[PDB]
Amino acid sequence: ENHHVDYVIRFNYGDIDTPEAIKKFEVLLLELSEVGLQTEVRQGDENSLFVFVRAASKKKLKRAVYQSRVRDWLYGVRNTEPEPASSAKPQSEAERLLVIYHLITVPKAEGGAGITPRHGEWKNVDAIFPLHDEETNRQCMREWSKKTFLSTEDLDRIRNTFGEHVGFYFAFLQSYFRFLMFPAAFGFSCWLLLGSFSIIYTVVNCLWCIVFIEYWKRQEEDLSCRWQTKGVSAVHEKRAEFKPEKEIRDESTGEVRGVFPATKRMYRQLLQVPFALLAAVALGAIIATCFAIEIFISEVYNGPLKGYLVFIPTILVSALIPTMSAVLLTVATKLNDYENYETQDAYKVALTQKIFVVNFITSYLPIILTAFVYVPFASRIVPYLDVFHLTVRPFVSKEHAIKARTEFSINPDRLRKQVIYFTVTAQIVGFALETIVPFVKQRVFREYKEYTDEDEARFLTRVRNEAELEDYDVTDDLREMCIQFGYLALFSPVWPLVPVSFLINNWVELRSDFFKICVECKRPWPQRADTIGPWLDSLGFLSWVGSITSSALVYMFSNGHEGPNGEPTTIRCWALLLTIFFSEHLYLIVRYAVRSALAKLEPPNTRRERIERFMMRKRYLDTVLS
Ligand SMILES: [Ca+2]
Ligand SMILES: [Ca+2]
């Protein structure tokens, strides 16, 4: 059905001249041939060729699979001795696709073709992608669209098709959804019986966050042992953009390495603090200014055309936060390049960590402003917001803009409504923008280009369609789930139905993300992983911060949703600070206890890998060494 194709290499010739294009193309085909791959060339687009790649021989494929397993075993990623090369069948499609992707991409000295798409020698090579297995995808979709949980076999199927990175994301999402049943039930019970800002709800929520994060750390270790990816960072793919200072030739492996001093990278990484403060200043200024405009227009201004003026600050936020975030991403990418980052995974993790500052600010600063600035203050702030009358000025006359004043009277519903927005309406709108609109845009751009050799015209047209799809990044889905967890950990006392909303959304999220991968994206090459990465630390940080924000909220809103109704008088600053101190330190103590208790419970795959290391050394001692 896929015509035995392993990868499609898109070669762009449009932006270069014919002689250089022919020379580069011959070099590409020669490298593919010399690394043991069989090529077939077809017209991809009007400006690109498709190089269809396949293992030239079953013997060569078995040899490459055996060498990959041997490298994994030598670097300690697996403990079982690699089976001989005559029995070296790829145990899944993910393994064959990974071996062939390495053959295509790892440098010539490392034993492959050095095709680095969108790099120096290969800027014409635009994309290297495998083909979706449409029947398997549709079977999986229809099968687990009718179940509650995905089986371990279902997760293994995802890993065997898309690799362990996508597999880890779906395993984490399934575990998060399963753990969300407890806070969903408990928060519905509290919303029914206690209402919001309940001490018991906040305590149970912090305890649940602790338990889920520690359980997932343990489960990640177990799953990386079960998928044979534990310690996979030892064989992390180098990135071709790495600028070494000196070239050293280690004696263990007869190769030059290209060393770069770690302390120099740390000096360059000192610039992350100024970047973080820049992003905080810019994004917080935009967000707080738009919040002040929103407050003025919606609650201080009392002139004509109030809806058409209250839609102003939401528009300005929706236009300016994406733009400022794109600028900050450009700055973060330039800083990530300045830091040298030998490996692609280190580069990706560092960029994700820089972007997490922007994510935190843009996701949580609105609710933080409403909760800890608008509610306690803003009876002392709205006198300073008369200056924002000019935002309404190009619509209303100067006198009508001035005589539009009212008793402020803080809206005791503002905070609950903002939390309900971010945890329900944002979820629905994000589902729409994430699955529906890209799908419709793809179908529209297809029928636009489709409206205005005979035996492979269908396969070739569907390959040309797959070539237009988006490049899936599992980091985006992990980011979304971690930001959602942050909402739960930080602001769930305001509205205890947040975990119910997240439970429903995450059941739908598993299926809709799998659909997006299979239908709206090119099939990702089966990248490996032994963890969700920096997102685990992000979740730990968010739960820590939530122990502070939730206790502050429970203190401030003890008397109800109004709490300090605009005045900071009722808030005793020592009692708020003492609440925060004891809550955060009870949190840290309970987290230490839970982590230490879970460290005493070794999971089965972890214990099996330890015993297997022992058994491998015993086999070595029994065969050689007498
Ligand atoms: Ca979504
Ligand atoms: Ca998603």
Author numbering: 12 to 463, 487 to 660
Original paper wording:
TMEM16 scramblases dissipate the plasma membrane lipid asymmetry to activate multiple eukaryotic cellular pathways. The TMEM16 superfamily is comprised of Cl- channels and dual function scramblases/non-selective ion channels. Our results show afTMEM16 thins the membrane to enable scrambling and that an open hydrophilic pathway is not a structural requirement to allow rapid transbilayer movement of lipids. Scrambling by the TMEM16’s is modulated by two signals, binding of Ca2+ facilitates opening of the groove while the properties of the membrane determine whether the scramblase can thin the membrane enough to enable lipid flipping.
To improve the quality of the density of the lipids near the pathway, we carried out symmetry expansion and additional rounds of 3D classification, which yielded one class with an additional four resolved lipids, for a total of 32 resolved lipids, 16 in each monomer. The observed lipids define the nearly continuous interfaces of the scramblase with the inner and outer membrane leaflets near the dimer interface (lipids D1-D9) and illustrate how the poses adopted by individual lipids result in the profound remodeling of the membrane induced by afTMEM16 near the lipid pathway (lipids P1-P7). The C18/Ca2+ structure reveals how the scramblase reorients the lipids that approach the open scrambling pathway. The downward slope of the OL starts at D5, a well-defined PG lipid, and progresses towards the open groove as P1 and P2 adopt distorted poses with their headgroups becoming increasingly tilted. The IL bends upwards and P5-P7 become increasingly tilted as their heads climb around the intracellular portions of TM3 and TM4, coordinated by the hydrophilic side chains of T341, K345 and T334. At the pathway, P3 is sandwiched between TM4 and TM6 near the constriction formed by T325 and Y432 and its headgroup points towards the extracellular side, such that it is contiguous to other OL lipids. Notably, P3 and P4 are oriented with their heads facing the outside of the groove. The distance between the phosphate atoms of the heads of P3 and P4 in the OL and IL is <22 Å, showing that the hydrocarbon core of the membrane is thinned by ~50% at the open pathway. One unexpected feature of our structure is that the extracellular vestibule of the groove does not directly interact with the membrane and no lipids could be resolved there, as they cross the open groove at the T325 and Y432 constriction. The wide intracellular vestibule is embedded in the nanodisc membrane and, at the open pathway, the P3 and P4 lipids have opposite orientations, suggesting scrambling might occur in the groove region comprised between them.
